[PDB]
Symmetry: D2
Subunit: 317 residues, 4 copies
């Protein structure tokens, strides 16, 4: 039987017997994602170039408006907005959404892959909506994932029962279920990070990457990959295995990536696929935020590889 994202979400909703508010959220999110992809692939560009005589701003506008009009959300935290967004009373619902509307849109001049990342939280108190409702630990996530605008457009959706991958067919505007319940390899052969920052590496990271290149035994050295776009680099790790690092050093003791709308959804997708995601000191999903735009270090991927990193990291503790 053929399966779409919309058919998938309704069947899970009927199993759980909810009211439908979460499904209205996800459907709005898919629709916004399809409009973003259309703009990213440059539909209608000939008109700007004079046939008859902004991209991340538009992206944030498509996601914002579609969520407000869903009548299912109450607080929206975005990489584009300095303060959290409070939905007006007439359009209010019960969910909290943290998103990066166009991850990697800084290097979009080289036609690099870009993506939309989201984490969806349930609102905990009945107090007036405010920023405090987005300050939950990654363990509290209801669902999370990302859109990859790569050679094709794919939506990866993680929930309690696991991770599923959907492919956008642009002829009809439908996400097609193509990979059910994916699990990451127990141990990989690729390591992923920016080695240009070598002089600033934490001493454990230095040794761990050295062990990937010069094994003390006779194993094969690892290969290396780094796109510079999180949605792309993390998605390769899921599909091929290996380790992804944007770690802490003395210059950025808390890392560079934002915890809420980058680190948490990817940590969630990883753990639901059998992987791990750590800061070195603790699991990313266990961190309690105190600011919506706060940073977190992250090392994620295959479990044997993260354990091997934690072994070196603790050796230097």
């Amino acid at each position: 039987d053929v399966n779409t994202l919309t058919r998938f979400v309704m069947e899970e909703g009927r199993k759980a017997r909810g009211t439908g508010e979460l499904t209205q959220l996800l459907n709005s999110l898919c629709t916004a994602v399809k409009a973003i992809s259309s703009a990213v692939r440059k539909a209608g560009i000939a008109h700007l170039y004079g046939i008859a005589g902004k991209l991340d701003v538009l992206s944030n506008d498509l996601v914002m408006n579609m969520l407000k009009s869903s009548f299912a959300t109450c607080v929206l935290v975005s990489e584009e907005d300095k303060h959290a967004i409070i939905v007006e009373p007439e359009k209010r619902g019960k969910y909290v959404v943290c998103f990066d509307p166009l991850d990697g849109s800084s290097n979009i001049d080289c036609l690099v892959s870009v993506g939309t990342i989201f984490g969806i939280y349930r609102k905990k108190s009945t107090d007036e909506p405010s920023e405090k409702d987005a300050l939950q630990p990654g363990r509290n996530l209801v669902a999370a994932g990302y859109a990859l605008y790569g050679s094709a457009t794919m939506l990866v959706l993680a929930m309690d029962c696991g991770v599923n991958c959907f492919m956008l067919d642009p002829a009809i505007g439908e996400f097609i279920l193509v990979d059910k319940d994916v699990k990451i390899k127990k141990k990989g052969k690729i390591y992923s990070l920016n080695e240009g920052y070598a002089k600033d590496f934490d001493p454990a990271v230095t040794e761990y990457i050295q062990r990937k290149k010069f094994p003390p035994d006779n194993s094969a050295p690892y290969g290396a990959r780094y796109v510079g776009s999180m949605v792309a680099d993390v998605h390769r790790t899921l599909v091929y295995g290996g380790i992804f690092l944007y770690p802490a050093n003395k210059k950025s003791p808390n890392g560079k990536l934002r915890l809420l709308y980058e680190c948490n959804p990817m940590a969630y997708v990883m753990e639901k696929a059998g992987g791990m995601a750590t800061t070195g000191k603790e699991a990313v999903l266990d961190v309690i935020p105190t600011d919506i735009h706060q940073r977190a270090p992250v090392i994620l991927g295959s479990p044997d590889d993260v354990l091997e990193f934690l072994k070196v990291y603790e050796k230097h503790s």
Copy 2:
């Protein structure tokens, strides 16, 4: 005024007052690229998954058929085909085409950037056509370039008078002139290579990469990017500046990339944009081929960055 790819090539053809055989070729190749892009973006994939009840092989078949049926070619070399292709007598024209129909289609499961790379030669010998007609050095190219199937679909077109970039507008299926007479930065700040082969690196490469991480003049360290797909890495280098390296290792004593339909078209675009491309001993475009699938090492990019590598290279004899 709006300019398209077809209008651009027709304008250049009347300037040159040629017959139009090259125009029919370029038009045929552009049609093949618009077809491949539609396949890479998964248009119509919903039917494969039963809505009504290989990709690089297809890419190879689309480029093969459109070039044959243009009546403009006589020898065709492809990464998918073990031997060169001899075009039948009724469809022969005066040009020779070397192409990789879907470069990077190995990592196409991680939705990595993929692309089509091509190089165009006027047949040189008057002999009956054979594989020897594709063994010309890259200096002899009439035109060269690539389609990058990234976040959007772009065609980069290089010729004697320079490099032009066209953006595919899928709404109307037309390439739109968006970057006229493009030039690479004189010097960049990103380096690109697979550091997993560090244990097999030649001493010259070992030293040059050391200089990128720990600069001797206390300048800021370069950043590193490595997609693992040549079309993406080169286009990022072209759009931003910097250096791209795939040198030899123990597994590849003659280097890894293919000279005919990977290294040379990229050497041509670089030099036509003001960049450089070397193997260490000589310019890639100066290499005289003896076998159609032969390998070459390559270091290319911004002119100041490649000169700095060769300076280190001659230090080690």
Copy 3:
């Protein structure tokens, strides 16, 4: 606020808080409509014509497979099938759907307008399903409507509270609501029928056409339009006003158009918009079918015009 067809159906579905089975139905039907439209507009025709080396049949297969796999249907009557289709046990649900997957596709060689017409009924008995579940009169319709593949693709959806029109935006694959709670004019200025059949006209129709061309009270005469595809003509009647006639004559005492999947869903749309639809003797919606493929004559449109037709009609006994 922007509204899509999917948002419209879920919000109405939550208004009634039904099980979700009818929503899973309409979502599947909408998905088939987008697929038909893409093939009707000739997406991918280059592959059929050998770029790398039926339409009503595919249309019927898309609607059949998408409805079966919705788990919301058990009996399906289609213009393409001699007998009704009984859904297999594991996929049986509670709704009955009548559809013409591609109305007017015989004249598709002149690129005339084509359309999909559908009506949805509820299962009548709790016994095992059979054809009798589709032999309901039009008065029982839960929903009905049509897609018009014209200069654009529009979905007109009629239900208890009235009729709404949605426009397919092909860039993103979403139906956008453009006309809310539509009503036809009380009286129009256009009549629509095949006047080449003048020789077989009932005396009443002849007189009614006489008064439109030569008004006895010197009002201005009506204009004439006749496309020859029912979905197109009916939609023109709704948008501009007037009357559409395919009536009974001595040769076809029961008309030409089919009652289940052409006449009934169109009569339903008209009445829900403030119009009328008659066979001359009674309302179309009051007709009891005895065979899934039985015919009925139809006169529909503006209320003053249907009454003026019946006025002449009753004078002639």
Copy 4:
């Protein structure tokens, strides 16, 4: 072998060993036809209805056709249904051709999603005077090429020239016109007539009789069927594809007809003849009328050759 319109035009242009001006012309028109098609299909309508928080279609269509032709460097006078006076292309962008076009015919009923179309006729500039409006006052006999885009259930381009008529189907996945029907010819005699019978009370005595013969044939053969979409491009292309007759004739209230000679009557007549059909005004051939005004009207009766002749026989009985 697969054939596209761009490949087809480059091949014919190379046979004739021309300069390339006419191919650059048609290529610009094909692109204008694809942008119009994309707009008529309502791509991007979600932005007009507030999905993220303009021009009428005939204004955009006329702007698209105008801009692409000027920028082709192949034209010098442009007559459009939208513009009162002829347009003289500025000196730096002048070429040798004159184009009379209707950019979106039938766009009045576009609210009922009726078929719409683009009609065009191409002339070479004849005189060596500085270009002016008079350069468009040539009779239809002078056409280099003519045709139409029909934005119907699919988008098709019909191109007529000296050697005949060819049809291309737009594949929107790649944006290419694909040659699908080569060298079309209309049937010698059809079974469909096309005109607005609602205005019967003003009919000329012959048109009354001819339509009388089609509904109640004197030889008791089967009657013709009637079709009238109300949009010229859809109706005429149906005539070409299936045969029959299309009529918009003269009456006492409109002695010169309603349709315009330059950008409606002549291009449809030209396509008809190059496919084996006829097109007449009753008194003379459409292609033989010498205009004195670029927006002057003409009656037109066109379609299968045998069907048009039966009209002219009735026409002359009434002198």
